[PDB]
Ligand binder design. Structure first.
Ligand code: FAD
Length: 447
């Protein structure tokens, strides 16, 4: 059985892992059009802030290691096209230019996504950078120590834009974050959380310009100004972190795609064509909080889908369990995590929700280490089932969101969580911990 896997990132990598323990017998070919196998863009912030010194160590696999395991790894080789009926792909060796046709029994593709660029006047003057991959990591890092870079503008105020803004603010640059949306990180957190984070970012000389449409980049050869509908901002460097586009234009006509370019797949990761499976950022995933499919471009999702494609390689025997959209990040001193439905998610899906927010010290009054923590519990107004939660503190309490993720999947209610058995010891928490306290408040709100 010959399986070809496209992509050495999170989705393609886990497919090769699961093939190795479920089908040791197979002839496995792993293709990667780039130069470097399994670079983790996840570690870009640690590298840009100097926590990791060697960019080449920000990876989780090497080709040599997989070859030792019997996998045929092909870096610098691109899969140019798929011929689904005759079960062939044409591949192009990018160093020699030679093209060849390769046959397969099963094909698992994890083609990913590409940074969305703004197509505006000035589109690419020099020093308009993107943030994905090893090459962009290296160039961004060189700009961190460049004395000519004083003002950097990042467009986009999501996860990636706020990581870039923090990295350049910590390198001593003046940062402006510009976005059409009204709150940074709105997709992940609600207003009571982003209000605290906005103050924290402004205390570290990041200006946040929300509700503005970028119209053109101005500059002579290299960028010098970013002008929006409302303002003009000096810029020595722009980091565009507006979003991501699925890498699927080459598949139009070969596989069925949604209007937005995402590949159509079912709960067994099968595409519209026999024996080709698709995984990762280029696909939708079952979202349990709202029982619908949503595109949630996270490493966790791609890795789980990759293993489920291999489990269903021969028979559609194992439907995907679904996910809650769990994410987490530290922004300067604050560590936050969220899962499930929040306000922006409820608006997009047309879902009605209720919520309680508790803001108090997470340790008992007599313990001098006590600090404030914010916890918001989102639940269904009719059934009182748990739909989502968001937590933030300067203390790391983020692992508690893992219990909420399971609670949503298990369809537990506010009453279940109010009396759920969580340990108490006064160096770690209160007798009713952060989850118990918010759920107890929700029970009182529904009495
Ligand atoms: C800055 C940054 C930070 C992030 N941090 C986190 C985080 O901390 N936590 C989290 O869960 N997620 C994080 N993510 C998201 C996560 O990285 C993605 O969800 C994940 O990488 C998607 O994996 P993928 O395999 O679907 O696609 P991609 O990562 O986009 O990889 C696709 C791979 O396949 C290759 N390829 C594409 N076409 C071809 C072809 N035709 N032939 C051969 N090879 C090809 C590409 O070169 C690429 O290497 C982050 C993303 C970024 C950009």
């Amino acid at each position: 059985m010959k399986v070809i896997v496209l992509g050495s990132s999170h989705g393609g990598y886990e497919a090769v892992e699961e093939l190795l323990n479920l089908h040791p017998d197979a002839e496995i070919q792993w293709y990667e059009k780039g130069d470097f196998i399994s670079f983790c863009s996840c570690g870009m912030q640690l590298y840009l802030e100097g926590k990791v010194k060697d960019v080449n160590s920000v990876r989780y696999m090497t080709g040599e290691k997989m070859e030792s395991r019997g996998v045929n790894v092909f870096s610098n080789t691109e899969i140019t096209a798929i011929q689904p009926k005759e079960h062939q792909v044409t591949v192009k060796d990018l160093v020699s230019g030679e093209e060849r046709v390769e046959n397969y029994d099963k094909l698992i593709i994890s083609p990913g996504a590409v940074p969305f660029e703004l197509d505006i006047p000035g589109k690419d003057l020099d020093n308009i950078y993107l943030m994905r991959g090893r090459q962009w990591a290296i160039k961004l890092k060189q700009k961190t120590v460049d004395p000519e870079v004083n003002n950097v503008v990042v467009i986009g105020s999501g996860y990636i834009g706020i990581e870039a803004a923090e990295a350049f603010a910590k390198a001593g640059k003046k940062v402006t974050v510009i976005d059409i949306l009204d709150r940074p990180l709105g997709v992940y957190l609600d207003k009571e959380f982003t209000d605290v984070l906005t103050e924290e970012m402004e205390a570290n000389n990041i200006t946040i310009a929300t509700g503005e449409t970028v119209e053109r980049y101005e500059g002579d050869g290299r960028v010098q100004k970013v002008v929006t509908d409302k303002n003009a901002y000096d810029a020595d460097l722009v980091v565009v972190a507006v979003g991501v586009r699925p890498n699927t234009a080459w598949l139009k006509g070969t596989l069925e795609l949604h209007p937005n370019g995402l590949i159509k797949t079912d709960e067994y990761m099968r595409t519209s064509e026999p024996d080709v499976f698709a995984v990762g950022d280029a696909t939708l995933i079952k979202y349990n909080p709202a029982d619908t499919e949503v595109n949630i471009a996270l490493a966790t999702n791609a890795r789980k889908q990759g293993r489920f494609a291999v489990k269903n390689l021969e028979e559609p025997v194992k439907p995907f369990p679904g996910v809650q959209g769990s994410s987490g990040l530290a922004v300067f001193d604050y560590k936050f995590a969220s899962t499930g439905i929040n306000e922006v998610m409820a608006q997009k899906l047309g879902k009605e929700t209720k919520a309680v927010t508790v803001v108090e010290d997470y340790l008992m009054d007599f313990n001098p280490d006590k600090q404030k923590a914010w916890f918001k519990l989102v639940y269904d107004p009719e059934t009182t089932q748990i739909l989502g939660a968001q937590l933030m503190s300067k203390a790391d309490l983020t692992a508690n969101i893992n219990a909420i993720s399971l609670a949503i999947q298990a369809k537990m209610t506010i009453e279940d969580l109010a009396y759920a058995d969580f340990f108490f010891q006064p160096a770690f928490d209160k007798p009713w911990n952060i989850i118990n306290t918010a759920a107890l408040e929700a029970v009182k709100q529904e009495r």
